């Protein structure tokens, strides 16, 4: 059930509750390690409280202390960076971002920049969301912030620490102009992962021939490594090339040789012979307003999409499928 409909009364009392629990966790992590039995008894309650904290409006000092506790003074073994990030997104859902929490997120991502000294050490998140999404949220809710400490760090950045280079790459919008130039001095587009890293940070606005040759090289590599035994993976790059082709942003009709080894690839390129029996409705979930408008406008499969849409919405009770069919009538 949509729990956003419920009304929250006496926000002050719950605010004090979370202030107290955040103080407790900060005191716990701050010194002497932890009390093992008390930690095992209390960590789940703390995590649940911070999770449910999304629906309560919080005072400035309130959510400031709460976010500082959630990021800094929380042991790393329970929530990785991705769960911490989505947790932050939830608790910022209700409350718009003031200057203070920008200071907090900035200096914590500074310590993150400090962490990636060992090349063996790489940040890991269960949900696949990392500090680049942090930088995305500063850009979203601030739109003009320029970091000082990160710019200073990348100014004294050399060729040795590759992890520093490809970390500062993913947060380039936060980097200053001179910082950006210093970072791109040693940075070149080598593989695909770098390619959509630069795309996501916003450097790339169109596919110059370098990106085209890189993606077709990856396509040749996957065609080579497919051929006797095969293994399923969840890298979601080939579907990205398919959605690129359907959007007509790309204009190289050379990858049509790559029909067959996966679904959700040929449906954006050659939907007329996609053999709709293998269509998984979950595809419709991943796209957005613009892509949904596009596949609504294509009209060569819209009947099939509406058939699977009504079938799923009748069989399922997710109540999101009704939204997706109702908004654009695909």
């Amino acid at each position: 059930c949509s729990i956003d409909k419920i009304r929250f009364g006496e926000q002050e009392k719950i605010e004090e509750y979370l202030v107290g629990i955040a103080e407790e966790i900060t005191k716990q992590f701050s010194a002497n390690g932890m009390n093992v039995v008390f930690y095992t008894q209390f960590i789940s309650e703390a995590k649940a409280a911070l999770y449910f904290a999304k629906y309560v409006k919080l005072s400035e000092e309130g959510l400031g202390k709460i976010v500082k506790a959630l990021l800094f003074y929380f042991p790393e073994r329970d929530l990785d960076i991705g769960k911490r990030y989505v947790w932050l997104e939830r608790l910022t859902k209700c409350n718009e971002l003031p200057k203070s929490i920008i200071s907090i997120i900035d200096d914590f991502l500074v310590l993150q920049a400090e962490k990636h000294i060992d090349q063996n050490y790489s940040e890991v998140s269960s949900n696949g969301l990392y500090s680049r999404d942090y930088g995305a949220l500063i850009k979203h809710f601030e739109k003009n912030f320029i970091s000082k400490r990160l710019s200073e760090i990348t100014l004294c950045l050399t060729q040795d620490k590759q992890k520093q280079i490809d970390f500062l790459f993913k947060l380039l919008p936060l980097l200053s102009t001179n910082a950006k130039s210093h970072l791109l001095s040693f940075k070149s587009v080598e593989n695909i992962n770098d390619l959509m890293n630069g795309i996501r940070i916003g450097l790339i606005d169109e596919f110059t021939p370098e990106h085209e040759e890189l993606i077709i090289e990856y396509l040749e590599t996957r065609k080579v490594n497919y051929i006797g035994i095969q293994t399923f993976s969840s890298n979601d790059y080939m579907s990205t090339f398919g959605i690129w082709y359907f959007l007509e942003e790309i204009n190289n009709s050379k990858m049509e040789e790559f029909i067959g080894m996966d679904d959700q690839y040929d449906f954006f390129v050659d939907p007329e012979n996609f053999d709709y029996k293998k269509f998984i409705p979950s595809w419709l979930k991943n796209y957005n307003d613009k892509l949904l408008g596009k596949i609504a406008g294509n009209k060569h499969m819209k009947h099939h999409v509406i058939e699977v849409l009504k079938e799923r919405v009748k069989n399922s009770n997710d109540k999101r499928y009704l939204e997706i069919l109702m908004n654009y009538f695909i």
Binding site: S122, V124, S126, D133, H140, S233, N235, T240, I243, N286
Partner: protein, 116 residues
Amino acid sequence: TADVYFKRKSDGKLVFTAEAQTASFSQAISEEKLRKPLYILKSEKEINLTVKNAFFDLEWLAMTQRYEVEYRIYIQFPNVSPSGEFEMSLENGLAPEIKFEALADTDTDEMAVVIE
């Protein structure tokens, strides 16, 4: 009725065995409004595994005072992490369940691989 071989990343030592009961494949999207620009195909990929019975290796507990698993045709699943939740019960207790979820690294961008 499928067996579970949970083993270390660094070596081939087997941490334990088990018989998994359920796998969650919660792949979906994040909040659309808060997350012309080139399309990136955002997703909230999440995979978790839950098992009811586990037999513990004697060697690990012998010298123990980022792993991976094989589920059995048979599917390997790397870069895993246990989840540490335990609440006790008034009733004496008996089967040791455990949950481990999928830890995704930045470079690989893929989490599930299958072999046959």
